[PDB]
Write an enzyme that holds these catalytic residues in place. Structure first.
Site, PDB file in Angstrom:
ATOM      1  N   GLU A 172      -4.514  -7.848  -4.787  1.00 29.24           N
ATOM      2  CA  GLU A 172      -3.569  -8.804  -5.367  1.00 29.24           C
ATOM      3  C   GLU A 172      -2.127  -8.307  -5.398  1.00 29.24           C
ATOM      4  OE1 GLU A 172      -6.526  -7.939  -7.051  1.00 29.24           O
ATOM      5  OE2 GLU A 172      -7.457  -9.631  -6.003  1.00 29.24           O
ATOM      6  N   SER A 231       0.763  -1.243   0.000  1.00 31.33           N
ATOM      7  CA  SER A 231       0.000   0.000   0.000  1.00 31.33           C
ATOM      8  C   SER A 231       0.797   1.299   0.000  1.00 31.33           C
ATOM      9  CB  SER A 231      -0.987   0.012   1.163  1.00 31.33           C
ATOM     10  OG  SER A 231      -1.975  -1.006   0.931  1.00 31.33           O
TER      11      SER A 231
END
Ligand SMILES: OC[C@H]1O[C@H](O[C@H]2[C@H](O)[C@@H](O)[C@H](OCCCCCCC3CCCCC3)O[C@@H]2CO)[C@H](O)[C@@H](O)[C@@H]1O
EC number: 3.5.2.6
Length: 265
Positions: A143, A45
């Site tokens: 993913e 992230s």
């Protein structure tokens, strides 16, 4: 705590994984500490900061507005959407989406934004445009957090990420207002920001974006410095370690402790 480089090494020993780290002066780009800085690590992230940098670039060019409200559907949502799942009826502005992605780790908000910039390929093209010829995004949330051994997809290097972050925040590639906006989003992180402040000595500035993946993947891109100033960019990535999340967090905090105790270098 021991010197930064020695602590980083101890962390690999204890975790049985690879650690990638860069400590860089934000204003000048001077590299202070570099460990496996040219090796690849999954971004996880932390890629969201680059993502919103691309969004701000579009805003500066007049091809986007942070005010623009995007209406999306439930079928568009992916795993972990604390903010986006609450606005199926009223939508969210592009600016709200970036705030949700960066400060609350909202994955659906990130995917919606990723679409606006041409998806993984479009973001990678953006990176190439600002001179980053290494970092690459290939997949969407979640993913992109798979972190398969030897997989080059969705990776960066500590050196590349540090340089890219510095470019977005200070090189005037983005307008003054956009640079200030990207910085404030990192300052406002609610996922790890408050926790980090709770353990930082008084006087230390922190702005950040964290990430977590499979096979122990963990990472953080941050701004840190004494006298309440964002003096340096610190990028730390961990990969291929079977350690608990707690210990991985502890090791990263430990490297930070070493920097704090031995700041003048
Ligand atoms: O002499 C230096 C300092 O030593 C301690 O500070 C400790 C603190 O009690 C502890 O909680 C932290 O752990 C690390 C906390 C930071 C964790 C996040 C760091 C991030 C920063 C951004 C990139 C990744 C790491 O270490 C420091 C340094 O020893 C004392 O409590 C403090 O009075 C004193 O000013």
């Amino acid at each position: 705590s021991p010197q930064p480089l020695e602590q980083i090494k101890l962390s690999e020993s204890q975790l049985s994984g690879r650690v990638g780290m860069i400590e860089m002066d934000l204003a000048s780009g001077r590299t202070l500490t570099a460990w496996r800085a040219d090796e690849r690590f999954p971004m996880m992230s932390t890629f969201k900061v680059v993502l919103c940098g691309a969004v701000l670039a579009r805003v500066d060019a007049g091809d986007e507005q942070l005010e623009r409200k995007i209406h999306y559907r439930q079928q568009d949502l992916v795993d972990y959407s604390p903010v986006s799942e609450k606005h199926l009826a009223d939508g969210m502005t592009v600016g709200e989406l970036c705030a949700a992605a960066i400060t609350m780790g909202d994955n659906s908000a990130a995917n919606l934004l990723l679409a606006t910039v041409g998806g993984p390929a479009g973001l990678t093209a953006f990176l190439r445009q600002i001179g980053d010829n290494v970092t690459r995004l290939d997949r969407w949330e979640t993913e992109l957090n798979e972190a398969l051994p030897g997989d080059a997809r969705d990776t960066t290097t500590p050196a590349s990420m540090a340089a890219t972050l510095r470019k977005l925040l200070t090189s005037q590639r983005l307008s003054a207002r956009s640079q200030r906006q990207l910085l404030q989003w990192m300052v406002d992180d609610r996922v790890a920001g408050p926790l980090i402040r709770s353990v930082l000595p008084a006087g230390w500035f922190i702005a950040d974006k964290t990430g977590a993946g499979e096979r122990g993947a963990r990472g953080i891109v941050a701004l840190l410095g004494p006298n309440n100033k964002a003096e340096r960019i610190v990028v730390i990535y961990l990969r291929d370690t079977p350690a608990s999340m707690a210990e991985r967090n502890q090791q990263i905090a430990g490297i930070g402790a070493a920097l704090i105790e031995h700041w003048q270098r």
